Amino acid sequence: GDDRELAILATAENLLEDRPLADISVDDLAKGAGISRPTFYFYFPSKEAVLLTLLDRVVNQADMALQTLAENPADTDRENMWRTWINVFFETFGSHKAVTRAGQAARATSVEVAELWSTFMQKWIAYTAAVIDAERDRGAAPRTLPAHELATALNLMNERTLFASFAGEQPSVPEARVLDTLVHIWVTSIYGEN
Amino acid sequence: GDDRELAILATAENLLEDRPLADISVDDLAKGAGISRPTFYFYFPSKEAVLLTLLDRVVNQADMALQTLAENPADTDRENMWRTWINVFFETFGSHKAVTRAGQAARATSVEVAELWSTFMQKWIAYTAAVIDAERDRGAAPRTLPAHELATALNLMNERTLFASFAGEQPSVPEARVLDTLVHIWVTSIYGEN
């Protein structure tokens, strides 16, 4: 069973590179996976449910990598620490642009997609705030904005900026400049006096 | 003619407070405006076209206010200058939350909405970069990131952060804290050494 599910998921990710989910049919997905339409419906209720699963897989991948990072002793310098951290988002989502793009669009129409994304964001925002607090506690960063509010805006910047870059949106930061850009804003706003 | 158009537009904005565009019908819009369905279709081809016009009106309102600001002699202090500037976006879009929310959703499905927003963003990003350049030229700010790339990320942060706040998204910065948050990030990233 898991093999057919995997093939449906691989097909959907391949087709999402070429067109939106609205222009991909259940027949398209079934054909690509080498199954019939009713066999498709045994594994997934809808093509939307397929996207939800793909998004869950990509988000889980980012989460697992961020968890490994958090578990290693911190950084080398503070700037490099944050670069390595933001890089996990850049590489994970940038390696699944089609799913990322589709998932972002789906948040507006799907409560499940919206909740999946919200849970992920809340977790890594809370982590970011805890890190900022610890930096302040050790005298490495000044006590400026409430850490959770600062953490929220910075992560939301990362979300919008990375996703615009991946998609080549007009306007966007070039993908090759996006890491340096975000890192600068993080380091200045976290460690800068104000 | 302009009166009936105005009434259609007022109705659409009122109904968008309560439900998405997908749950508002042409009959809903016609009834609210005191017109028939075919009279509606004389003024607008679709309910989507109604949203496009509403979004155009709100965006133009922000643009006109930003143009007035740009035309006045600059600031008092640098932080206050940026606060007053970002405030135009906060007040203009925050005074039309329903249309803002609907328009953001529509970017994914409408090339016209996507182009309207892109033109606006490109203009005020270019303006922001020009201001950063001038600050550097006068020795008020250090030459760090390329000004246009920095300007792009900061404006994209503002977009995502304001719109999440307006909508009470989880996660979001509280609406009452959003200005202070964005201003801090702008001032530190623009004027901070790095």
- C-alpha B159/C-alpha B104 separation (Å) is 10
Find where tokens 């959003």 sit: B178
Residues A38 and A75 reside in one and the same domain:
no
The token duo for A164 is 């615009």
Contact between A155 and A121 under an 8 Å Cβ cutoff? The reply is: yes
Q: Compare all CA atoms of chain B with the CA of A157 and give the residue at the minimum distance.
A: B157
Residues A31 and A82 reside in one and the same domain:
no
Q: Which of B118, B152, B177 sits opposite A173 (nearest CB)?
A: B152
Residues B25 and B37 reside in one and the same domain:
yes
Flag if A173 and B185 touch (Cβ within 8 Å).
Answer: no
Residues B12 and B71 reside in one and the same domain:
no
Amino acid letter, B108:
A
Residues A94 and A60 reside in one and the same domain:
yes
Going by C-alpha positions, the residue among B49, B66, B170, B153 that lies closest to residue B103 is: B49
Residues A39 and A51 reside in one and the same domain:
no
Q: How far does chain A reach from its first CA to its final CA, in angstroms? A: 57
**B40 Cα to chain A: minimum distance (Å):** 27
Residues A38 and A61 reside in one and the same domain:
no
This entry's atomic model was obtained through X-ray
Residues A110 and A176 reside in one and the same domain:
yes
- C-alpha B158/C-alpha B182 separation (Å) is 7
Contact between A173 and B152 under an 8 Å Cβ cutoff? The reply is: yes
Flag if B171 and A184 touch (Cβ within 8 Å).
Answer: no
State whether residue A180 sits within 8 Å of chain B by CB: yes
- Number of other residues whose CB lies within 10 A of the CB of residue A143: 10
**A8 Cα to chain B: minimum distance (Å):** 25
Q: Which of B156, B173, B184 sits opposite A194 (nearest CB)?
A: B184
Residue A187's Cβ-count burial label (10 Å; 0-12, 13-18, 19+) is buried
- C-alpha B168/C-alpha A190 separation (Å) is 24
User: Is residue A116 classed as helix, strand or coil in its secondary structure?
Assistant: helix
Residues A32 and A62 reside in one and the same domain:
no
CATH number at residue A95: 1.10.357.10
Contact between B50 and B8 under an 8 Å Cβ cutoff? The reply is: yes
Interface test with A, best of B149, B150, B166, B180 (most A CBs within 10 A): B149
Interface test with A, best of B19, B119, B180, B189 (most A CBs within 10 A): B189
Contacts 24+ apart (CB under 8 A), A57-65: A57/A9, A58/A92, A58/A93, A58/A96, A58/A99, A58/A100, A58/A103, A59/A116, A59/A117, A59/A120, A61/A92, A62/A88, A62/A89, A62/A92, A62/A93, A62/A120, A63/A120, A63/A123, A63/A124, A65/A92
CATH number at residue B19: 1.10.10.60
Residues B12 and B73 reside in one and the same domain:
no
Domain residues for the domain of A22 are 1-46
- C-alpha A123/C-alpha A64 separation (Å) is 12
Contact between B170 and A122 under an 8 Å Cβ cutoff? The reply is: yes
- C-alpha A118/C-alpha B172 separation (Å) is 10
A-B Cβ pairs (cutoff 8 Å, strict): 113
Chain A contacts of B177, Cβ < 8 Å? 146, 149
- C-alpha A155/C-alpha B31 separation (Å) is 43
The token duo for A121 is 């964001």
Going by C-alpha positions, the residue among A84, A46, A68, A47 that lies closest to residue A179 is: A84
User: Is residue B34 classed as helix, strand or coil in its secondary structure?
Assistant: coil
Find where tokens 């565009």 sit: B21
Interface test with B, best of A120, A152, A178 (most B CBs within 10 A): A152
Residues A15 and A111 reside in one and the same domain:
no
The token duo for B35 is 């017109």
Distance of CA B103 to the CA centre of its chain: 9
Residues A30 and A94 reside in one and the same domain:
no
State whether residue B167 sits within 8 Å of chain A by CB: no
Number of domains making up chain A? 2
State whether residue A110 sits within 8 Å of chain B by CB: no
Largest CA distance in chain B: 62
Flag if B150 and A182 touch (Cβ within 8 Å).
Answer: no
**What radius of gyration, in Å, describes the C-alpha atoms of chain A?**
19
Q: How far does chain B reach from its first CA to its final CA, in angstroms? A: 57
